[PDB]
Amino acid sequence: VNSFSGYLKLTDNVYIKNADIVEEAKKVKPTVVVNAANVYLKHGGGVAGALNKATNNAMQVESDDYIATNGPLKVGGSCVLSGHNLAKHCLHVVGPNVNKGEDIQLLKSAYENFNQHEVLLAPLLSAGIFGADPIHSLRVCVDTVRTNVYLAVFDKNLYDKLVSSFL
Ligand SMILES: CCNc1ncc(C(=O)NCCn2cnc(C(=O)O)c2)s1
């Protein structure tokens, strides 16, 4: 038993809700919140900009130190950093950005990072400003992640659409 509330169960291990991940995170304090990161951990917009703003820019400060030490992530890769006031940990995961020409097949590799964590609160990778089809992202999520994932979908219209079209 865990503290997530109001989710629709899609499969044995995947759950979905219409929620703001920032507000969802501040209420659950999950062990892991996933950020829709880029390779530079520059949290300007989308999910990343919103999560970072909720940390009063502490996420960005920590991220800049990480990059200065380690260099950029790989597309499809991840790193674990602090969750600040939102979660114990933040798993920064880089899905391919279609608006940058990155190969969509890397979306499966991106979701594989979730399997290193028993339970996660997460957005749909490569959705929103990353330019991929969210219906495809949900399919890859379901077919790749084996751990327990609670997906927060900000937009209500898209949420209804994802549910109604789910196979
Ligand atoms: C006082 C704090 N100010 C703010 N609160 C919320 C903000 C926001 O932009 N949220 C939406 C960003 N987002 C979340 N999920 C997705 C998705 O791709 O599903 C996209 S900004």
Curated annotation (Swiss-Prot):
It is a multi-pass membrane protein. It is found in: Host endoplasmic reticulum membrane. Residues 1-167 form the Macro domain. It comes from the Viruses. It catalyses: Thiol-dependent hydrolysis of ester, thioester, amide, peptide and isopeptide bonds formed by the C-terminal Gly of ubiquitin (a 76-residue protein attached to proteins as an intracellular targeting signal). Inhibited in vitro by GRL-0617. May form homohexamers. Interacts with N protein. Responsible for the cleavages located at the N-terminus of the replicase polyprotein. Participates together with nsp4 in the assembly of virally-induced cytoplasmic double-membrane vesicles necessary for viral replication. Antagonizes innate immune induction of type I interferon by blocking the phosphorylation, dimerization and subsequent nuclear translocation of host IRF3. Also prevents host NF-kappa-B signaling. In addition, PL-PRO possesses a deubiquitinating/deISGylating activity and processes both 'Lys-48'- and 'Lys-63'-linked polyubiquitin chains from cellular substrates. This is Papain-like protease nsp3. It comes from Severe acute respiratory syndrome coronavirus 2. The chain holds residues 1025 to 1191 of 7096 of the full protein.
